[PDB]
Amino acid sequence: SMAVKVAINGFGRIGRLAFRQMFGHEGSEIVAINDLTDPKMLANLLKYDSSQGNYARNHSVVAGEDSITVDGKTIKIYKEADAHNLPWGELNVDVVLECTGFYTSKAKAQAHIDAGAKKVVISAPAGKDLPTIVYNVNHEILTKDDNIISAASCTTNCLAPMAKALNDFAPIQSGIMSTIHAFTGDQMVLDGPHRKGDLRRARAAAINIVPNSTGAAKAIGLVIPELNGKLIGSAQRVPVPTGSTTLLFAVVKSDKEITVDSINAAMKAASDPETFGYNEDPIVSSDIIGMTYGSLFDATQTMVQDLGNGLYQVEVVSWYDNENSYTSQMVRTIKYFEKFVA
Amino acid sequence: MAVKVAINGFGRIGRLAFRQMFGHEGSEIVAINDLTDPKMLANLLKYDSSQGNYARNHSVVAGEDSITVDGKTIKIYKEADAHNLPWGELNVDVVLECTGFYTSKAKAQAHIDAGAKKVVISAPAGKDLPTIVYNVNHEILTKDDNIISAASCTTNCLAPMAKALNDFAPIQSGIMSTIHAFTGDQMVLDGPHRKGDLRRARAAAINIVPNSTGAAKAIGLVIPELNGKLIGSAQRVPVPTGSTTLLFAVVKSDKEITVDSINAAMKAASDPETFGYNEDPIVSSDIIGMTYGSLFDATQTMVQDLGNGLYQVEVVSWYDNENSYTSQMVRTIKYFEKFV
Amino acid sequence: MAVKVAINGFGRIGRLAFRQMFGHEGSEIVAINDLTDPKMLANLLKYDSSQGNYARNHSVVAGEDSITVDGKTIKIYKEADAHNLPWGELNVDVVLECTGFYTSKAKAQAHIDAGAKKVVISAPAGKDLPTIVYNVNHEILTKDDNIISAASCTTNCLAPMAKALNDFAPIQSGIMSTIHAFTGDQMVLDGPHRKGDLRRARAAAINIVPNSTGAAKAIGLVIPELNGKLIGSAQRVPVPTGSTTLLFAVVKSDKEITVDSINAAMKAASDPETFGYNEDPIVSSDIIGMTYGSLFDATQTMVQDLGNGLYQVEVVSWYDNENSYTSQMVRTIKYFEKFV
Amino acid sequence: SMAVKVAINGFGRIGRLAFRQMFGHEGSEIVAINDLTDPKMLANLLKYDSSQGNYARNHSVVAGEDSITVDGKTIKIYKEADAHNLPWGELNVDVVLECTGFYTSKAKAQAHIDAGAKKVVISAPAGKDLPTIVYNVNHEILTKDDNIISAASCTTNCLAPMAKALNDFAPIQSGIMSTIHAFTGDQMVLDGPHRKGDLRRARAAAINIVPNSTGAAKAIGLVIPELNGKLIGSAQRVPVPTGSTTLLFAVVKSDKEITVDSINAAMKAASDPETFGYNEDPIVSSDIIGMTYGSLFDATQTMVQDLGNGLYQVEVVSWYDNENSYTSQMVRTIKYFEKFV
Ligand SMILES: NC(=O)c1ccc[n+]([C@@H]2O[C@H](COP(=O)([O-])OP(=O)(O)OC[C@H]3O[C@@H](n4cnc5c(N)ncnc54)[C@H](O)[C@@H]3O)[C@@H](O)[C@H]2O)c1
Ligand SMILES: NC(=O)c1ccc[n+]([C@@H]2O[C@H](COP(=O)([O-])OP(=O)(O)OC[C@H]3O[C@@H](n4cnc5c(N)ncnc54)[C@H](O)[C@@H]3O)[C@@H](O)[C@H]2O)c1
Ligand SMILES: NC(=O)c1ccc[n+]([C@@H]2O[C@H](COP(=O)([O-])OP(=O)(O)OC[C@H]3O[C@@H](n4cnc5c(N)ncnc54)[C@H](O)[C@@H]3O)[C@@H](O)[C@H]2O)c1
Ligand SMILES: NC(=O)c1ccc[n+]([C@@H]2O[C@H](COP(=O)([O-])OP(=O)(O)OC[C@H]3O[C@@H](n4cnc5c(N)ncnc54)[C@H](O)[C@@H]3O)[C@@H](O)[C@H]2O)c1
């Protein structure tokens, strides 16, 4: 039957990467894109990418007056800062991919529904009161009554699969997460006033290690309810343009033999071909650039310390392309979500 | 009595200017205006990723409506439109305009309307106002100049060098290429650029980025004898600060034009404040924080004989686009104060 | 029967060449020699920081004395001296010399002594052997030439562009500046450089570093009509790969020399494999992994009339110093194989 | 009396930074420098530094044929890869600062003593059989009978003060350390064969997050005997040229009130003006470049989780300039060690 109609709000890093994957989807049709700039700018950003490859080498991208044309397919372009002004209704838009970073609450995203959209997927955490989905961990909780959902954050899609497998193997008592994270667009190019008042994100991104807060651990309860309230964590932003790593320091309680090898073997048993991969090579961050795993466990860094009485302090580490890993996960979730539309 | 000075735009240039003006006995920094709160401004002043840790030698404390630096209290305003600033009631003499949003005489007039007596713009600002490179043309300044430009970083590097070369062997024409540190007008990662520049939209720290520059084309404002003789462009590269200017000039002379005679002339033209002379194998991080507006690099001079008195010449000089420019702008401001 | 090929030096160029030769039906990679063990060599082939994850599409496994790629077994040697290699008995036809330590006909002769029939050096290597830029002068090759040079990355960028300019409007003289990615001959942090270069001793990733280059001086080897007309130098900047060449030439012509007529000439000389033509606003990361030896950037062309048929002209082209060079060298090797 | 005669073996990052500090110490005299290069190369590296500032702006440095002259004072230069060939004895060298990275054992460093030097301070870990010193943590165990000592590693000088204060406040059961570390000279500029066979240090330093092993946590027992065997850890090398941070994830046992505030207040009580500083501003790595603290506790990053029954999992974080923080600690140790000559 008819392909599901998809609009993208915000043609940024995530939006353009989701475009690369949705545009090839036979079961979908990208009808419109909205941003804050003209078609030639959007076409050039789509064509050339500093970290994720030269898209123009395999595709023809051409800008029109009010549209872009990719491989013959014409997509209309809008420039509306307020979603209420978007014509989602006349375009019969089924799903809005909300990737602006400016509609991150169920109340804000509701504007898309008011404009005539049927469903909205927010490409970020967007509160404690909406469905937060990590594909292949809890995407099956989605129902027809969910109109606005969150695809969580890049760190949550990396932490969740790993935390779940560990917890299933040896119950987690508590854990502290540290993510060593590529710099992103919400940091400054050089020291300058940050619009949100964050004094550390105001510092030059490419020449600093920058401590930053993250809510990925504290909000793990939305994705893995048995871990609700057990994890806290934070981030260090460092000078790589993409590619990140999550380190979890957990206290686990178990009667089993808890060793580096038994830990690694459980992680390997929990791996799957789409979301959670298993690695034993000495890779570094540039090797995971562009991968489609949401999370890649690194068996080479597993550490274990026996505290006695069935208690252990354990370190498990996994890699993620904060751009493309998240995007591939968000896209899988979108493809599943579409069943509730058509 | 000390001259009352306000800073509009507490950015890279405004904060570096502050470091130097704050110590000037002949001036008093009365106010700062930007688009953020006092705590943000105090933190940016205390810690700098490329120009050093200012909090190590100074006390900076944020208040509700001010900052206090070394005991001295400075008022802080948050007005995007200069007409709303109380320059008149603060009896401000000179406004340092460092926002990048008032770069024309008509736009800068707002500061004077608000009650200031003089404005110095920290950028090129049209062809119709005094454009000043200290120790090249600052003496054209008169009492009737209310709004002036301190030109650009690249112009403050090129002018001393081009002038000295031209005085030695007249330039027929020249092409400038500047290898330039990335700046705040480029994006941290690939994204939509607000002014529609497709190259500036690219990630700053992992790309060589060609970009346009008007420094060579507008050199006539500073060195009238070179008017219309130079063109040029830029390459932005991944260093946070520190830049180099390469001039490829065809010169005509009956003299002996060699790498040595060229270098000896550059040295003869050097002076202790603006235009320095280097013969060491330095690299860009070595000039970070220097106070020369321009540092000629004798190690890179090249000369080719075209015959019949014509030569093609490459001369190179270094500049800290942040602090070299600032030191020049501050010299100009101190001179400008005589008219207040 | 397929041509038997050995690689000496499994570095940036050696591994990138492997990537292109391994799929060639007319070739068979028989051996690899370096200064490390098979596991080290296998990991480097698998994962590359700037040229992509090779392990995503290929199977690479290290053995005790070999590596196996996609089922094919390749012997590995660890011999610092080329005389100790068993080239003769493995019946190696062509040796790809990519170590950087055999950069002369006399040194490269060792490979022939060890029993190989032909040697291609991945660098400039003297005046006493053929220096080849594919699609510029590769056709001078004969069967009686046993050792050839594939020139330098910069030469492979400069030559096609200089040739096209010169054919259009003869060059009187020129000065070249290349803005170049840092490479393995620079230090990771400031430290003693073994070859005594005071600038290559400085940290590669946080500096603009002037350095000398012989590409312009030796253009005569590839384009004899330009012999002695060009000089040049380089600026190493903090990108791991991707470079650009700027040529500032004085040209003499009776024709209409404009940015447009220059660009149109370049487009006319472009071709599908070696010399490409660009009019998009690209930056250096866009040309990573490209297979052109040279990509002319029409957006940066500049021209100044000096009067009397003289013009000063700026033409610019891009090149991936690693893979652009490699693609040219692989084209040269494949042509060279006809003589085997 | 006579100034202590000091020789520097290895004019690298640490040797040159140490020179800057020692050269001004009146109680010392830098008599010789040995490396693998000529005076011209050494003089330029001392004048200009990509991360630690332009030294020539404040000093005159001039190269001769076999010497350098800094502010008028002439210093002899040697090029001897084997320490046995150095004329330490005839120059009456008291202390050798061993900063090459090639004499990191009591047995290798003994070569300097054989050459006629009286004492050696190695700028790295160098075994379990010699004194390993973190200033203001255990430097007072030094005796006149100690001829060869280790100044430990940069990470150890950051970890030791923090772990000690934590342990003194609430005893550590076990801990895992992660250090986010500036790239260093033992990584490659671009992907290439690493001489020591480390497949990760073989990768380009400035464009990768690179996992690496470290023995700092594992060997903390040499400096803090009560923590022996309780800590393990590793590192992530990232693309900043200098400036590092250490994260310690410790399980502690206590009957006291263990909170982020009680932890931070304990850390502050343990701070001192020279070695262990206390921070509450939102700094990032470039702010600590060139600082002289060996360790700078970051109170803004403290985390605590209650496990019940007196157990807590805690995160404490400290900053350090892996180059100049370590050098400053090593120089304080050298100045103290001089009492025994
Ligand atoms: N980049 C990452 O690593 C990453 C990973 C996971 C989730 N996210 C989340 O995805 C969202 C976007 O991330 P990003 O890195 O792509 O940022 P981005 O800056 O690259 O993209 C934002 C885009 O949205 C447009 N935009 C902004 N406000 C708008 C409005 N009111 N109306 C229409 N368009 C608007 C901007 O022009 C820009 O093109 C954020 O919520 C971010 O937190 C980012
Ligand atoms: N950074 C350099 O290398 C350099 C060198 C020479 C000249 N300049 C010029 O100096 C000016 C400032 O440059 P910068 O590098 O410091 O940029 P910047 O982004 O670091 O600083 C600009 C500051 O002005 C403030 N601002 C912006 N709009 C404003 C408004 N309407 N009202 C009040 N404040 C406002 C911003 O908050 C910011 O703090 C620009 O015109 C620039 O071209 C810069
Ligand atoms: N990297 C570039 O941008 C580039 C471009 C064009 C041409 N080249 C030239 O290609 C050559 C190799 O360059 P590279 O970038 O690959 O350097 P590289 O350091 O990455 O690789 C050189 C390889 O040769 C090996 N080697 C060194 N000495 C040896 C010996 N005695 N015997 C056997 N093997 C030895 C090394 O182990 C290393 O693997 C150089 O001459 C260089 O100038 C380099
Ligand atoms: N750089 C740091 O962050 C750091 C921090 C703490 C401890 N260290 C330790 O200090 C030591 C030196 O470190 P670095 O950063 O200065 O490295 P470096 O490469 O910058 O310095 C090494 C110097 O020693 C010289 N050298 C090498 N072998 C020699 C020999 N046989 N004889 C004489 N001179 C020789 C080299 O020419 C070079 O100048 C190492 O043990 C290192 O682990 C380094």
Author numbering:
A (entry chain C): 15 to 356
B (entry chain D), C (entry chain B): 16 to 355
D (entry chain A): 15 to 355
Q: What did the article's authors report about this structure?
A:
Atopobium vaginae is a Gram-positive anaerobic bacterium of the Coriobacteriaceae family that is held responsible for about 80% of diagnosed cases of bacterial vaginosis (BV) in humans, a condition that can lead to obstetric complications and gynecological disorders. One such virulence factor is the glycolytic enzyme D-glyceraldehyde-3-phosphate dehydrogenase (GAPDH, E.C. 1.2.1.12). To perform its glycolytic activity GAPDH requires the nicotinamide adenine dinucleotide (NAD+) cofactor that remains tightly bound in the active site. Binding assays with recombinant C5a and cell migration inhibition assays by surface-immobilized AvGAPDH of granulocytes challenged with zymosan-activated serum (where native C5a is produced) have confirmed that AvGAPDH could functionally act as a virulence factor, a feature that might contribute to the infectivity and survival of A. vaginae.
The determination of the crystal structure of AvGAPDH to 2.19-Å resolution provides a detailed description of the overall structure of this enzyme as well as a high-quality view into the active site. AvGAPDH is characterized by an N-terminal NAD+-binding domain (residues 1−167) and a C-terminal catalytic domain (residues 168−356; Harris and Waters, 1976). The catalytically active nucleophile Cys168 and the activating His195 lie at the beginning of helix α5 and the end of the following strand, βI, respectively. The crystal structure of AvGAPDH presents the closed conformation of the enzyme. NAD+ molecules are tightly bound in an elongated cleft in all four protomers of the homotetrameric AvGAPDH structure. The relatively low B-factors and near-unity RSCC for the NAD+ molecules argue for a very tight binding of the cofactor into the NAD+-binding pocket. In the AvGAPDH structure there is no residual electron density at the Pi, “new Pi,” or Ps sites, indicating that they were completely unoccupied in the crystal. In contrast, the equivalent residue in AvGAPDH, Gly257, establishes a hydrogen bond with Asn336 through its main-chain amide that has a similar length (2.9−3.1 Å) and orientation as the more commonly found Val-Asn hydrogen bond. Despite the overall conservation of the peculiar S loop sequence in AvGAPDH, there are several substitutions plus a Gly211 insertion at Ile203-Arg217 in the middle of the S loop. These modifications cause the protrusion of a turn containing both positively charged side chains (Arg209 and Lys210) toward the crevice where the nicotinamide-ribose moiety of NAD+ is located, whereas in most GAPDHs the equivalent turn contains only one conserved Lys (Lys197 in human liver GAPDH). In the crystal structure of AvGAPDH, the side chains of Leu50 and Thr114-Gly115-Phe116-Tyr117 surround the NAD+ binding pocket around the adenine ring.
